Amino acid sequence: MNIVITGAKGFVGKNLKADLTSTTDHHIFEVHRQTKEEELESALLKADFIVHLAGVFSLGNVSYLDHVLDILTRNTKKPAILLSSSIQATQDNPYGESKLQGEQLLREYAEEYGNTVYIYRWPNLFGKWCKPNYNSVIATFCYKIARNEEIQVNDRNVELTLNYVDDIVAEIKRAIEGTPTIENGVPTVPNVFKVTLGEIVDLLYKFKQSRLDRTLPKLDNLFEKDLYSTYLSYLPSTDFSYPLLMNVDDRGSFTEFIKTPDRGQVSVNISKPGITKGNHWHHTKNEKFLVVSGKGVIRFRHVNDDEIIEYYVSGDKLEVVDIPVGYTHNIENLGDTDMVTIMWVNEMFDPNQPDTYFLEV
Amino acid sequence: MNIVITGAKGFVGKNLKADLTSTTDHHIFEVHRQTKEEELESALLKADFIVHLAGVFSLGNVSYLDHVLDILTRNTKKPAILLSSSIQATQDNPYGESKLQGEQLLREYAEEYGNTVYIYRWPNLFGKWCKPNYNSVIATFCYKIARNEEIQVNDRNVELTLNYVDDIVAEIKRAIEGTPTIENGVPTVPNVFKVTLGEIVDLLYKFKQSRLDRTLPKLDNLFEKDLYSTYLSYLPSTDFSYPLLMNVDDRGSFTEFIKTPDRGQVSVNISKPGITKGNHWHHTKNEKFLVVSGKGVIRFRHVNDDEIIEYYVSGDKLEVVDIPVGYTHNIENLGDTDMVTIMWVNEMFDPNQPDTYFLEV
């Protein structure tokens, strides 16, 4: 079908368009405030569904929605209309009152012409293509912090009610096919978050500093997860990468990749053609060795024993070798090319309280 | 100094010995129930510290502690004595009463001869070298489950009070140097756990099945962490490794390594000498690429744009490249040897709700 998006050059617009063009077969007609009146009528008349995302001469009727509905008046089919209103319609301030006037206008128009309408009262939004140093405080904070530019926070206790652009787009796609999410008898976007400005700033700064301490976001917390992804989007195009700390010597190198306080950490060990590393055991520290290039052996020997157990392994067949506690173990490069072993460990490395003890074989 | 360990062939014994010999300079004399009376006197007389871990002719005094104290009677120096009693001393059952008689005996002996004594009331213990199908229900469960042998659980609600052998050993080492952990005026091992048999069996089964779904233990939960390490110790010496699921084709392969619900997952991508993979973008799925062998490029292009950004990278210099949302990206092998890239992703892969969209460049 034909979908027209008013305010298509906006934050939600660019996102909805990108998704719809890739995820669907529908013909998408974009409408922005620089779309000659000629095509505006064109697209509107062709329309099967209208996603009205656009905004709201010091005198005179300048309502854009009014104009749009006016033109749709000559549309054979009764295309459904989606109206993005605000939770501000409640409050009594110019912005809220304006958005309220828009709903009212649309319901009246609907009762006369019969178009099915989906009116949502969205809260503040956040997500990737929002513009910084404009209206969105989150986009501004992400953009600045990712550039070590200082930010200004008047009150960290200020609460924010939000919806992530991903939900917004998923809900619109659901309305587009007549299955909107209803709650309290009205269409309403799911997963609304209530967060403090302070919590946001902390999270953002943590995201930036996580680059250095190889830290990760708590991914089972929806808001944090969504915030992390949007933060990444405001990254300078020349700052997508960062150098890791390689510990180098004659045997090769050992590099930490990812560290977490609850699921261990993973590092990369590189061993030169003939060296052997290890020959030690642990009380409770334990690992998972995975060689992704080269070939060699991982040897074990229970502390109270003489039998040596060997595990020949290489990058051709990917297999993990657990390192059970209480066994000294070592790993050796048996090939002529560097051996690279990915190592997962159940805890952070601490030279003061190490849990590793030297013991050959 | 000289440390004698009675019951040195026991669970805590083997552990204390292993640690002390590697972590310290002290001379360790092991004493077990097969140590001729000759040396028993020998070691006891030489002793500077006694760690009494040993146990408690249907008629007659058969108390081993009584005998030990008797011999120490002829020890010039007044070596400190550590006595492992049980929280059972409270209860009124043969075992508890016995352990109570031991404390009493030691305090009386101490008041006369002046030896400083450290009396602890330990709960049930668990840890690596405990023997299965004997007294420890945890060791038995680990040993069996790791062998797909069925287990028998009469009541899952049975509560267990435990101490992990690591704590036991750390506390003894602290007493050995006169700085025992005091609580309620008595020496007491830290980190006591209270767990249900059912919680234990669940955890154990989860540990075994985690092998297949590439899952990880919740490492910030002390009991689980300790339990996981002990479970690994009961693994058959021929079952330390497991095969990973390699997705193979012409371009190379993609293998999942580690999966978690809260910190993402990491996989291993292997690319043949000239292929290119990717050419897609995501809404909120994001990654971290790290090439550990070979060389190539990671290309980016914002969806609403034409500029192509390139990141030349290889295994010589280890550097992570974040994949920001909203940019299509692809990675290509520019070398003549296979390229292996470690890939961390913020969420599990789901072909139904994929968050990946094809888009060249």
Ligand SMILES: [Zn+2]
């Ligand atoms: Zn190790």
Ligand SMILES: [Zn+2]
């Ligand atoms: Zn990707």
